[PDB]
Amino acid sequence: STPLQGIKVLDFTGVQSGPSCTQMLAWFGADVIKIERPGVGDVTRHQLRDIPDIDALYFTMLNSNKRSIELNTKTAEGKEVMEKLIREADILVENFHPGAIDHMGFTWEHIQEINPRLIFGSIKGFDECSPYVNVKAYENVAQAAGGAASTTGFWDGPPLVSAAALGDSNTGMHLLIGLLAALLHREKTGRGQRVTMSMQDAVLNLCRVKLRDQQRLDKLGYLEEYPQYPNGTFGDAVPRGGNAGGGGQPGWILKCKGWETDPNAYIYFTIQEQNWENTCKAIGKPEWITDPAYSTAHARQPHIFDIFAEIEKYTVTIDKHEAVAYLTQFDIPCAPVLSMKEISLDPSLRQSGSVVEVEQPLRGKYLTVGCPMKFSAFTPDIKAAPLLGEHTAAVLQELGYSDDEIAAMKQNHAI
Amino acid sequence: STPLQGIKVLDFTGVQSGPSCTQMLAWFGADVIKIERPGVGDVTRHQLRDIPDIDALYFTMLNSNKRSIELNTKTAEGKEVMEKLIREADILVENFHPGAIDHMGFTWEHIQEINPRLIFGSIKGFDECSPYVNVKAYENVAQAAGGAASTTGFWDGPPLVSAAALGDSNTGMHLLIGLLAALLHREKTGRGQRVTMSMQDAVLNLCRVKLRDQQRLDKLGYLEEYPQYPNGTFGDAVPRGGNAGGGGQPGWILKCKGWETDPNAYIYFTIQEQNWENTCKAIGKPEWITDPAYSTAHARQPHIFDIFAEIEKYTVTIDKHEAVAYLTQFDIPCAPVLSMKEISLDPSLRQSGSVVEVEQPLRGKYLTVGCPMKFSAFTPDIKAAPLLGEHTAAVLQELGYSDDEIAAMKQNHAI
Ligand SMILES: CC(=O)SCCNC(=O)CCNC(=O)[C@H](O)C(C)(C)COP(=O)(O)OP(=O)(O)OC[C@H]1O[C@@H](n2cnc3c(N)ncnc32)[C@H](O)[C@@H]1OP(=O)(O)O
Numbered sequence: 022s023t024p025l026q027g028i029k030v031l032d033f034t035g036v037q038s039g040p041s042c043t044q045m046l047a048w049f050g051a052d053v054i055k056i057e058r059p060g061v062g063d064v065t066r067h068q069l070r071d072i073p074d075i076d077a078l079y080f081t082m083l084n085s086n087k088r089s090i091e092l093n094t095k096t097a098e099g100k101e102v103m104e105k106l107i108r109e110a111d112i113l114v115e116n117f118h119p120g121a122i123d124h125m126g127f128t129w130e131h132i133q134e135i136n137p138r139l140i141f142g143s144i145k146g147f148d149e150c151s152p153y154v155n156v157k158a159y160e161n162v163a164q165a166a167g168g169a170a171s172t173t174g175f176w177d178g179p180p181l182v183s184a185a186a187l188g189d190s191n192t193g194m195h196l197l198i199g200l201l202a203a204l205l206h207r208e209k210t211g212r213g214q215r216v217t218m219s220m221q222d223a224v225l226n227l228c229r230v231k232l233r234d235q236q237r238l239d240k241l242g243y244l245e246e247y248p249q250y251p252n253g254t255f256g257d258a259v260p261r262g263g264n265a266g267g268g269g270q271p272g273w274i275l276k277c278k279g280w281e282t283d284p285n286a287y288i289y290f291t292i293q294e295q296n297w298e299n300t301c302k303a304i305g306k307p308e309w310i311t312d313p314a315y316s317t318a319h320a321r322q323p324h325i326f327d328i329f330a331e332i333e334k335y336t337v338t339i340d341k342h343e344a345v346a347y348l349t350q351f352d353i354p355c356a357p358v359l360s361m362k363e364i365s366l367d368p369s370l371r372q373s374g375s376v377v378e379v380e381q382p383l384r385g386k387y388l389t390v391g392c393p394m395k396f397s398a399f400t401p402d403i404k405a406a407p408l409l410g411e412h413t414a415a416v417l418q419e420l421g422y423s424d425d426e427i428a429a430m431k432q433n434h435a436i
Numbered sequence: 437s438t439p440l441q442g443i444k445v446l447d448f449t450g451v452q453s454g455p456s457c458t459q460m461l462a463w464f465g466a467d468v469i470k471i472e473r474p475g476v477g478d479v480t481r482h483q484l485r486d487i488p489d490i491d492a493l494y495f496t497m498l499n500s501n502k503r504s505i506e507l508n509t510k511t512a513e514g515k516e517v518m519e520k521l522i523r524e525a526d527i528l529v530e531n532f533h534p535g536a537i538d539h540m541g542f543t544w545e546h547i548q549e550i551n552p553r554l555i556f557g558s559i560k561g562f563d564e565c566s567p568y569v570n571v572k573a574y575e576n577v578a579q580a581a582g583g584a585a586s587t588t589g590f591w592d593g594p595p596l597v598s599a600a601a602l603g604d605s606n607t608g609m610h611l612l613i614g615l616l617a618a619l620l621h622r623e624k625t626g627r628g629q630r631v632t633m634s635m636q637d638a639v640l641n642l643c644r645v646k647l648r649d650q651q652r653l654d655k656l657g658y659l660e661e662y663p664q665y666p667n668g669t670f671g672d673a674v675p676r677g678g679n680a681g682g683g684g685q686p687g688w689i690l691k692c693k694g695w696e697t698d699p700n701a702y703i704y705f706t707i708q709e710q711n712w713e714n715t716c717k718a719i720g721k722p723e724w725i726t727d728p729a730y731s732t733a734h735a736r737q738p739h740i741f742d743i744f745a746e747i748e749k750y751t752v753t754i755d756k757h758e759a760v761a762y763l764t765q766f767d768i769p770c771a772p773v774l775s776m777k778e779i780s781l782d783p784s785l786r787q788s789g790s791v792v793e794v795e796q797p798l799r800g801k802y803l804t805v806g807c808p809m810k811f812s813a814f815t816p817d818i819k820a821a822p823l824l825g826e827h828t829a830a831v832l833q834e835l836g837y838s839d840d841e842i843a844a845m846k847q848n849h850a851i
Pocket residue numbers: 035036037038039056057058059092093094095116117118119120121122124125144145146156157158159160189220683684769
């Protein structure tokens with residue numbers, strides 16, 4: 022068995038935020054029916070194709086295990102099919118522009134009358150209360166609005182976006198949490214409900230530690246662990262701190278052998294408070310162990326970049342992998358800056374099911390990120406992503422439509 | 437009613453990854469018992485205190501609504517209390533260093549025998565088959581190992597960490613998804629199971645789009661939307677792309693009025709493919725609408741920074757908020773780079789329950805990030821974080837211990 026065996030999901034989504042959520046639902050055992058505009062489909066099918074004329078990787082990596090129907094929900098037949106789908110489903114997920122699903126006639130209020138058990142999940146750029154409620158959002162728009170761009174990068178550079186999908190997949194994972202909680206809640210109430218997740222809120226959740234810092238800054242006028250302390254200055258808002266420890270212990274990105282020509286010849290190195298003695302032994306600085314300028318985090322902070330420079334005198338001499346193999350013998354929290362090339366080929370990531378090779382029709386093999394959490398009682402089976410409208414007939418037949426009704430829908434461009 | 441009403445959780449966690457997960461469980465209605473080392477407690481209680489002698493904000497913003505017991509699980513009594521707790525609980529969550537819980541005698545195999553219905557959630561830096569399985573991890577160590585640091589920042593600068601908790605809270609949210617799925621699964625099987633989540637995998641999941649790019653790069657030798665195309669060069673790994681669109685449409689961080697003195701006087705600006713005409717009207721370049729050098733994404737790419745420079749001629753003249761109010765009239769996806777100060781005071785974020793003022797004993801008011809997703813059938817009630825061992829006696833009494841038994845535990849330093 023699987024966690025969501027028997028659950029039916031209507032995936033009325035596109036791009037990344039909504040589809041990441043429903044892909045996980047499929048991997049958990051749900052029947053996910055992706056509802057797509059006839060002849061067009063999810064925009065990711067056509068975006069940044071590496072092979073002409075077939076679905077792009079953007080699509081296949083976000084839509085594994087789903088079924089695809091082509092349905093124009095703006096036609097009379099399409100609206101009726103949508104209603105029948107809603108009546109039979111457990112979950113409906115959508116991430117179209119603000120107002121879009123409403124204008125089709127499928128407001129939450131209507132969805133509720135059709136099926137009081139249905140859970141309706143909606144992703145938008147911003148909350149209902151926001152002055153930006155009607156604003157379209159992509160990944161980095163949310164990173165700017167949610168606090169991440171403000172606090173990422175260097176103090177003497179611009180705000181910087183993260184490569185990680187803070188606005189997209191992150192929001193999808195947050196919606197997923199809400200959908201699973203709503204399924205658990207429905208076990209008690211017998212009713213569905215609406216779950217909304219904004220991209221701004223998803224980014225803010227991950228920036229909780231910077232809201233901690235803002236409050237410390239408001240109270241004290243300084244942030245004792247930030248690069249700016251004590252020889253720099255603070256303004257009224259949490260500043261960018263380069264490669265500082267953030268929510269972790271103090272640390273930095275350090276150069277390893279090759280850094281001049283290899284943009285990934287680096288490690289992250291943590292000075293863990295309770296590990297100062299082992300840290301000193303690792304770098305051959307026994308004299309620093311009890312020296313009062315070095316023996317506490319507070320005393321190190323005003324010359325911490327001298328300390329990092331000293332560690333770097335060692336790390337630039339060996340490959341990042343060697344540097345880590347050595348330093349971890351001293352219980353130092355560190356790791357190489359792994360490139361996507363190293364990740365894509367890493368045997369341990371294949372073994373754990375974190376990077377998964379999947380065979381797609383026409384394309385053949387591709388890699389995707391697998392189900393990130395591991396369960397002792399079940400293993401997701403990750404499959405190909407659907408061809409556009411591959412399952413239209415089957416889905417309509419499951420709803421009880423006859424061959425004549427389906428032929429009429431095709432003639433009327435409802436499918 | 438609440439989603440997790442009646443669920444009992446043992447929170448054997450510290451710092452940020454584990455505690456973020458169990459805080460959400462508490463907000464969903466679970467009884468979350470935080471198990472803490474006597475006389476010490478979670479390290480976040482004393483990290484970066486802004487008020488002398490009381491719990492730090494790092495702790496209060498991650499431990500709302502929880503109960504706290506002091507229990508030394510290395511003593512004979514403490515082991516027996518832990519066993520009774522496990523027998524009565526639904527979920528046990530831990531994020532101690534690799535091996536730590538095992539060495540106390542609470543391996544998964546033993547947990548299972550005590551209570552076959554219990555779901556055991558475990559966070560570690562790396563997966564079981566990783567060469568780094570025993571390595572300690574903080575936030576940025578995971579960002580380095582998971583692909584984010586490699587691909588974040590500028591092409592001519594170092595790898596850069598994100599301010600967002602990609603390794604910590606993100607991992608907690610991923611574990612939470614697994615725990616909720618396991619509760620749903622247990623409805624079918626009648627059994628608990630083990631759910632494990634590594635910080636490296638959590639980061640990788642959010643970097644799914646960069647694994648897409650790595651495969652495109654492997655096939656083609658170039659990435660047509662990256663800043664390096666077509667006038668720069670590509671190596672064998674996905675490079676850093678500065679403030680480029682990433683998973684979203686092409687875009688950049690643009691200066692607004694005040695940028696020379698205000699590190700947050702900026703917006704993110706998206707050139708949405710289907711919006712080129714409105715974009716041109718917005719900036720007073722009607723001549724660019726059908727000009728073949730400008731009218732498609734492909735034609736714009738080779739001189740896209742000249743286009744951003746031209747937009748910046750407008751944005752530097754107005755404050756970021758005014759820039760956005762104007763540009764959104766043209767259906768342009770954009771938003772200001774909001775500072776943590778702006779976020780902390782934003783009335784709409786108070787109204788949506790995204791930033792929540794909570795009253796803590798002794799401290800008084802503080803702000804926290806609320807429950808990020810919104811539910812139509814219930815509203816989380818966010819409360820204070822527990823004082824160390826505040827609930828020890830109540831928890832032991834609930835387990836059936838007499839006053840003499842509790843007194844003996846105190847004498848024997850079990851509590
Ligand atoms: C990958 C990431 O997800 S990136 C960020 C994604 N963003 C979000 O999730 C936040 C909310 N979504 C949005 O803001 C927007 O969907 C955007 C910005 C991503 C894209 O917006 P746009 O491309 O301009 O339009 P969008 O795809 O949402 O909708 C286009 C139209 O298709 C219609 N549509 C969608 N499915 C169907 C269908 N099956 N049949 C007929 N019409 C359909 C919509 O109703 C809309 O028409 P309308 O404007 O007449 O009401």
